[PDB]
Design a protein around this ligand. Sequence first.
Ligand SMILES: Nc1ncnc2c1ncn2[C@@H]1O[C@H](COP(=O)(O)O)[C@@H](O)[C@H]1O
Lengths: 519, 208, 104, 208, 208
Amino acid sequence: DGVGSSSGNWHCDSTWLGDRVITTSTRTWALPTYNNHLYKQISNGTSGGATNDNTYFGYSTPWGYFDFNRFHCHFSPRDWQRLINNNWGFRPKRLSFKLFNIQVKEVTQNEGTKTIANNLTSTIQVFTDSEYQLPYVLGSAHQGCLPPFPADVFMIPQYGYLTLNNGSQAVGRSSFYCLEYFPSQMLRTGNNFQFTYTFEDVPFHSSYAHSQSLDRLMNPLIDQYLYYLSRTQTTGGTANTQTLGFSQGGPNTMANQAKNWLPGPCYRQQRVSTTTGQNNNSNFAWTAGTKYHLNGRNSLANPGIAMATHKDDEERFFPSNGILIFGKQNAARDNADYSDVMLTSEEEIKTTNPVATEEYGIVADNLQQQNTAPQIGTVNSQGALPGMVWQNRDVYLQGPIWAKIPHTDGNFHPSPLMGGFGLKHPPPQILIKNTPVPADPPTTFNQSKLNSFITQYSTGQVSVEIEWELQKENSKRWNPEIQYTSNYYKSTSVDFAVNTEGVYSEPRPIGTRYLTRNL
Amino acid sequence: AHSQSLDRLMNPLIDQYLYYLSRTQTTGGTANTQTLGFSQGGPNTMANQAKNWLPGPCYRQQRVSTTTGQNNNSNFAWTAGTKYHLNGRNSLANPGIAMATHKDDEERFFPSNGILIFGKQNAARDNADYSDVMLTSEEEIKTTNPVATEEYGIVADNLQQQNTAPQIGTVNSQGALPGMVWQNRDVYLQGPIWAKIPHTDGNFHPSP
Amino acid sequence: AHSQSLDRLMNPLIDQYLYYLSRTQTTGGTANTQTLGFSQGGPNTMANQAKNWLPGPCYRQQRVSTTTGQNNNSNFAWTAGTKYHLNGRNSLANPGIAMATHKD
Amino acid sequence: DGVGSSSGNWHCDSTWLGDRVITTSTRTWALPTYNNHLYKQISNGTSGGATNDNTYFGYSTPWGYFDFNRFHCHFSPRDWQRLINNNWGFRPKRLSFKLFNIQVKEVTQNEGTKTIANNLTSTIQVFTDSEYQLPYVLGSAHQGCLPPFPADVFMIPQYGYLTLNNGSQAVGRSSFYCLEYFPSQMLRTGNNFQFTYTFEDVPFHSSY
Amino acid sequence: DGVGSSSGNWHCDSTWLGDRVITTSTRTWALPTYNNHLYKQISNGTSGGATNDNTYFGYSTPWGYFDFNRFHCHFSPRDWQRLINNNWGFRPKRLSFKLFNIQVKEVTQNEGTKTIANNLTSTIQVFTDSEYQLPYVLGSAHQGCLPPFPADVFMIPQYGYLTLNNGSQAVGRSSFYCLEYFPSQMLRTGNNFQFTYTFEDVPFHSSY
Ligand SMILES: Nc1ncnc2c1ncn2[C@@H]1O[C@H](COP(=O)(O)O)[C@@H](O)[C@H]1O
């Protein structure tokens, strides 16, 4: 554990062992001093432009955090291809995390000339929130996760949290946390940190698409023995009067046939087209957005429960806030063009799940009578009904992996809505900070806290290893499956590769569901 | 079959210690103004009593009578049928979730596509007469499950105010709510025994 | 009691990497036409941010005030009561599923 | 015990064990050179404004001292809440003190441009007055105790003492102490110091 | 494995054992940062002067490589004379490779005055493509092999590779490689690297 001796090696690999795959990656990082060494109160209120829906109360902290909750932190594009093309399912089993080769540097600025030097005796502090005592800020799809491309050097994100608020104000229940009230390791150059974690049992992700649909599980050639009411009135001529007629479900009457199951739940969303001409001329993104109402505050249900993006033959349509959208490289933060972003599609689940932009179904609204014609209602939100079966949202190479399930008395089907695996005891937050080094103090005692510090940053490498369990395919299907493939024909550059300018980009979103399964 | 019903699980002889809002306005004369009055649930107030549980889920269906004269004169079997919508295709929810076929004293009524019907021997395939088929009844479950042809219940539609009278909504489809208890559909000698549960990520109560 | 709320589980300081549809129409002048605009959720846009969870179930009930003057002048305790219907009989859902009594 | 290796870790916690509670805290500190490396005689007398009630004779020293004699050095506000709300009494039993991760720095000033660098070979000296042979200046409610808030960085207080005086003058009985006449540990970066202490029996405080 | 301790010694010798000869050489090297830390796409096409015969698509990388594939890397002229004058044939049997005495330096430029200093805590990374998973760029007679003369100090060559192209364009089959997706050793000053290799059977060269 010396100044001149390395404390880690570079591990970035994948190994496939038939029923498992193990992924390792190492990246280089830089950490600044954040917040000037201070915790600060932050709020947003209703004054000025601001609106109720957007209020908060919280704190920002001197700490930074390590995030690897994006699939491409771990899987190279080819590796992801191996996985999706060949397996029915996968899930995480365990992980190894390492921090090594720490360098702490002090930067000196005089006279417009800046110089950087090592500070050999400085420390950084690290800890894991093993007991989940801090607010869990992973699982909100933030930036600052390790880069997809290994050669890229990245900056650690700042840590901050939120509590209860009224407008811009705190309430009694509001909580303040100091991270310095936790035990942490202090490392100088030459020291290292590691920890090991085991994933809890969780269901395999479905890397498959159904090749059957709920409404067509019968034998095409045979009638049912079960009747349905087929006629309510006679068909003679002008003489028509009420009658009761009953018929047996059959091949040409598949819609009428008795069935055992129901499609999944529905929370209907407005539909927008990629051909702008077909859209209404208003700015309806929020006004027509699909939302939930919590304590006087309205939130987009984005993306909400999983519903098929579009029905047959309507690729142009998407739910206004019902899909995941990734930026293309260098797409702008605000108001990026359609050509600048990539929209995901959940078309694969039309098979068991309702289309996002359409009704669940129809129910009766009234009681018909001789003098009252029957009336119906369109159902646009449907909660869980017995017999319902459904599929979860897909995961993407540039998508999230896990989320912490909130600690509540109850939940229903706690699969994270953005996609991924939901864990009660997810991987713990890892928090890192540079210890403050004071500049020279006054020569006579002053009680006030020191506000003059040396300027420092640190750099190092980090490693993550994850073991994934695979579910092999067992299909008896005769014909070939759909597969993810690279383009055959010539092109200006290779997809999933660098630029002339050295910039890595991921051209498209890649999902998981290529192989198929019966229902 | 249950010999008790969800709405009558109390002791008939004893009051609750729990109050409910019983009066919103005074009853003096012509002078009436708003007030708040609270009362304790009791034997003659069983409907008002506080309770622990809720009836089962609802997907309401049109009602037809075996006495044809009481039916509307249209052919409404599909147009008024209860359906689900999957990928542009509409299917009858036949027979759908289990709900009681009819309430007290109304044996004549059935859900248009909400029961199982068996043919009598040599009944025709198409357009058989009522006398040629046999209709099942799920009357036994009125005890915990909603009647097929009627609403789940009533919810508020608005916020009442001094100038706004309160308004209500009739609930015709109700998904699962905490506290709900229910019974499954019955089986018959000429009925099916089992079904394969579909291989899906999720399901709710997978009784066929 | 929870000291956090479902709608505020994020990091206040960081943007999401996920976009949402933020503009459906242009904002130029009188010339406005349809467009598609997409934005990233952030600190001042917390309502718009993508989220993993949903609030609990709802069976809505009429509201009454302890200040009588603010109530409607009718006796609406049963007529406006929240109920369930079982076999031709109506029962108050009292107290029913758990919902917060009032907001801030 | 190396330049590149840390000698301590950050411990700031509380654990409650039903009949005991253990508190740990760590803070970051800075120490200046005090007095220019010199002991100096100080007095206050009656000349000018000064009054008899306020006279003293004493010395100031190059040393600094560590003070944690304030409850909030050890208890977070919530922890204090746990204690006061639930217990009739409390008292201290034992303590552990550690000093680690020493950095000594040399500051160079030229021409209005100042630069700070490590001095790897420099030492600091520490000792405990185990035998109570020096004037005990703790217990007078001074400033310079560890901060209540863990993130705060603090400056070590200077050590000075008083003896007998007549006006601004010493008397025969007056005593002079040199701290360099005690044995002390010398630590370079990479060295650490610790000691352990046991409290004598004392009555429980009445938190009631 | 320390800052002040050497990790290697200088071996440059030849020993003749009648049926074998063993050659050892040591050279001093310098490695720059290449490509600004970036992989970059490179192509050559048919526009301008360029012709079809000369088109390519490829990448350039931040890495450098070690090349000793020239006989005079290993044989002094007199040694080569001993070999050619007296033997009918020769071939390689095995090799040992070592990297030692690493120094990483940081260069600071201000105001037209440049200064160079050690960075004690910096690393370099090394690896061998044992499984032949990268494009093999040795064997194309490039420059950058160790110098014939031992006293000469040399600069390490940059690593780049080629794939399939159409004109200046990639094709589907075109492959991109990142060297950071391999495991590599990280060494600070004071660390060293070595590996051993055995040649496969191959025919003797005909020195006749
Ligand atoms: N991503 C997830 N993480 C944790 N629990 C889940 C997740 N998705 C579903 N579940 C739960 O696991 C159950 C598995 O049910 P089954 O497939 O019938 O064995 C579901 O019904 C949910 O309660």
